[PDB]
Design a protein around this ligand. Structure first.
Ligand SMILES: COc1cc(Cc2cnc(N)nc2N)cc(/C=C/C(=O)N2N=Cc3ccccc3[C@@H]2CC(C)C)c1OC
Ligand SMILES: [Ca+2]
Ligand SMILES: [Cl-]
Length: 166
């Protein structure tokens, strides 16, 4: 099971402001949709409620400590262990955020899909710092910038840096 982080962040790692994206980049979200198709999205409750609805065509799995939290059209998991059990047959899952949710799956992540937006927004939540010498870029692509996607941004994909033995 490939554990993947899916993230869009600005130049200071901002990923949210008041439970919202500080930017409106529809093309970016279309990238996310294409990338995650046929794979579970794992997200915290707050992240889910910020989106406000289930993202169709995907296993939506909400992670919360709250045992009786349910929304229709979604699955609820209360721990990392519960997520792995739910996704036991999944080839790849996408950790969709909640800064806190990223921290939960940090010891397990195998792959990083990071969208980097070349702008500094006002923000109150951040993608956790990561040692990137552990990682290695396998793919990069400049995002579509235009009337509907004002900012400059780049899609990056990283896999684990393989150590060469002494
Ligand atoms: C704070 O609010 C949001 C946060 C995120 C997280 C996120 C964002 N970007 C990256 N790179 N990593 C991420 N982890 C995502 C969304 C928005 C999500 C969303 O509508 N979709 N994404 C999944 C998805 C899956 C199936 C169908 C539609 C969607 C739509 C896109 C359509 C309209 C192309 C969002 O609401 C606007
Ligand atoms: Ca792993
Ligand atoms: Cl969250």
């Amino acid at each position: 099971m490939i554990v993947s982080f899916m993230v869009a962040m600005d130049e200071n790692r901002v990923i949210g402001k008041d439970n919202n994206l500080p930017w409106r980049l529809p093309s970016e979200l279309q990238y996310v949709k294409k990338t995650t198709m046929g794979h579970p999205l794992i997200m915290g409750r707050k992240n889910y409620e910020a989106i406000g609805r289930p993202l169709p065509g995907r296993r939506n799995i909400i992670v919360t400590r709250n045992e009786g939290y349910h929304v229709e059209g979604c699955e609820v998991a209360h721990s990392v262990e519960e997520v792995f059990e739910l996704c036991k047959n999944e080839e790849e899952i996408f950790i969709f955020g909640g800064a806190q949710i990223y921290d939960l799956f940090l010891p397990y992540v195998d792959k990083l899909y990071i969208t980097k937006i070349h702008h500094a927004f006002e923000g109150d939540t951040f993608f956790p710092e990561m040692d990137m010498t552990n990682w290695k870029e396998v793919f990069v692509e400049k995002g579509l910038t235009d009337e509907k996607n004002p900012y400059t941004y780049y899609y990056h994909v990283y896999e684990k840096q393989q150590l060469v033995p002494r």
